[PDB]
Ligand binder design. Structure first.
Ligand SMILES: CCN[C@@](C)(c1ccc(F)cc1)c1cnc(N2CCN(c3ncnn4cc(-c5cnn(C)c5)cc34)CC2)nc1
Length: 299
């Protein structure tokens, strides 16, 4: 800090804009989309949330009655981050919330095709329909969305294929900001950088490590990272020594080269999400680049 005049703007301290508030009785709760020990996401129908769509399908993140304060305070914090983030094409964007007079409801875009893990398991036989160019489009859009998070000093801390969703028009959207921290329990260690596991250090650079693991998931068509390996003292010794995963079945040399850079042991030698977007842009048609900025512009 150059002087006392220059303050860090903490999103937790910022007031809640009531333009996000949506009446609880304009919301119909439908089938479960995801579930946990003390929380769940359900499908919903929102009446009067959008002028363009007076009756529009959405998804609703909510806690179970089993939840007990610790998860309740965090769900409120997850809402503060999403309100201060602003919108982006490749983020499941916040639509509204039910914060008054009862449990917290977070209302987000519904994504037609679901998570990338199950989406690729379905389309395995289609692969050799779903092409390799599709996987590169998924790879590129995640890099743009993480570039957006990093530009807002937002560390996702749980980037993976399960938290990447596919919406209408094959538009990739990153979801689940429950672990998201503004820079300065049970953990997804197989997606975590060594300095995260060992030194509790989470940066945008440790997201890049997780981006590498996500890349492996995509080009293994939904495979389990480090398959057959239990996470134990020997696993931590291999990760720390320098063990990496072998190239998956369908990735090219250029694509495996990206994972290798993402898994560099020195966090500062890993590439930026800006440079990662530039690299993947080469590996795609030029029609794609103009086709993306037109979608990004209209949004
Ligand atoms: C820490 C995380 N733990 C929790 C358990 C959590 C929850 C609430 C809490 F209060 C606390 C914790 C969690 C679990 N699961 C999600 N997911 C799932 C749902 N997913 C979707 N979002 C929007 N649309 N959408 C469409 C589909 C779909 C699927 N099949 N088909 C054809 C379509 C799936 C989605 C986004 C998020 N999130 C959170």
């Amino acid at each position: 800090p150059d002087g006392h005049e220059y303050i860090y703007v903490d999103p937790m301290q910022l007031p809640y804009d009531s333009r996000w508030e949506f009446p609880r009785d304009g919301l119909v709760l439908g089938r479960v989309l995801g579930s946990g020990a003390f929380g769940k996401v359900v499908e919903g129908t929102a009446y009067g949330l959008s002028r363009s769509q007076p009756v529009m399908k959405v998804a609703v993140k909510m806690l179970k009655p089993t939840a007990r304060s610790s998860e309740k305070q965090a769900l409120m914090s997850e809402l503060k981050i999403m309100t201060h983030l602003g919108p982006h094409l490749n983020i499941v964007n916040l639509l509204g919330a039910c914060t008054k007079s009862g449990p917290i409801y977070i209302i987000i875009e519904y994504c037609f095709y679901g998570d990338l893990v199950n989406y690729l398991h379905k389309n395995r036989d289609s692969f050799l329909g779903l092409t390799l160019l599709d996987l590169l489009s998924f790879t590129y859009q995640v890099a743009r969305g993480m570039e957006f998070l990093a530009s807002k000093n937002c560390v996702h801390r749980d980037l993976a294929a399960r938290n990447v969703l596919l919406a209408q028009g094959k538009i990739v959207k990153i979801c689940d900001f429950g672990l998201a921290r503004d820079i300065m329990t049970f953990l997804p260690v197989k997606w975590m950088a060594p300095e995260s596991i060992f030194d509790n250090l989470y940066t945008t650079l440790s997201d890049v490590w997780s981006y590498g693991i996500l890349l492996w998931e995509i080009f293994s068509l939904g495979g389990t990272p480090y398959p057959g390996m239990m996470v134990d003292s020997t696993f931590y010794n291999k990760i720390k020594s320098g063990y990496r995963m072998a190239k998956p079945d369908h990735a090219t040399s250029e694509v495996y080269e990206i994972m290798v850079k993402c898994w560099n042991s020195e966090p500062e030698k890993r590439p930026s999400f800006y440079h990662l977007s530039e690299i993947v842009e080469n590996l795609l048609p030029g029609q794609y680049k103009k086709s993306y900025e037109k979608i990004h512009l209209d949004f």
